[PDB]
């Protein structure tokens with residue numbers, strides 16, 4: 001088996017070297033592509049925009065994003081998998097030959113296993129939902145041209161994300177291909193599910209509790225058994241160039257809490273009391289109201305994102321991240337429309 005994964009690793013290293021050497025003027029473009037491809041933008045930009053227009057799309061988008069980031073974590077733990085920025089300096093494969101010279105970037109110090117890519121998986125899962133929903137909405141409200149344009153844009157986005165994750169290292173081509181396929185599969189699976197709407201308040205809590213308990217118990221069971229699931233945190237603390245390039249917000253534990261928090265926040269916002277009576281006469285039916293709601297949500301969420309929880313004790317950071325993630329869907333669905341209604345309603 002060892003002589004089989006080495007071929008894939010060497011192919012990835014050679015591809016990264018070729019991209020980095022023969023394309024040097026596209027560094028900033030690839031960094032920008034890798035920056036605006038974070039899932040943070042799927043909770044702070046896409047969801048507020050898509051919730052106030054055909055609100056059935058926003059709930060599906062949030063559910064797909066959360067379940068995709070839980071499945072990516074769980075399959076990242078078991079599949080293991082290296083990243084082409086510590087493997088180059090740690091392997092003993094490049095003996096009898098010169099080791100290739102690879103370059104690191106302020107974003108190439110990721111902590112975590114990388115067998116399914118997570119940027120590609122999330123981007124595919126979200127943009128497939130968006131494109132399919134738009135095609136369904138504008139279906140004969142010349143369609144072939146729109147179909148071709150939207151699918152071309154989707155595939156261009158996926159290709160650019162793959163090239164970005166390969167150029168800056170931190171991932172192998174088979175990893176990004178697997179991530180794209182898994183994201184598309186998850187998007188389709190939730191495209192054929194109709195129970196995520198009008199769910200009770202007990203359902204959301206039971207679901208998030210089951211996910212958290214499964215993750216924590218699985219980790220504890222393997223840790224007691226003898227294996228170490230958190231092994232990439234030690235290999236990223238030696239081979240990263242600058243010790244300031246690693247952050248705690250990219251620790252497998254942080255993402256899980258940040259996803260459970262936003263799921264619970266969406267549940268609370270949907271099953272609250274202000275949402276059920278947001279309209280008070282003539283409201284929630286006019287374009288100015290919804291456009292102003294979108295603008296206010298975007299501006300206030302962008303301002304509120306600046307509040308960085310203190311990172312001195314890990315438990316405090318985890319709980320504050322949970323609460324801060326829970327705030328955004330609750331404050332974007334229940335509070336801003338209520339304030340706008342009570343101000344410009346009479």
Ligand SMILES: O=P(O)(O)OC[C@H]1O[C@H](O)[C@H](O)[C@@H](O)[C@@H]1O
Nearest residue numbers: 072114117118119120250252255
């Ligand atoms: O695609 P990757 O390079 O593995 O990055 C994807 C991962 O980035 C962060 O570190 C988070 O832990 C995850 O929420 C995300 O899935």
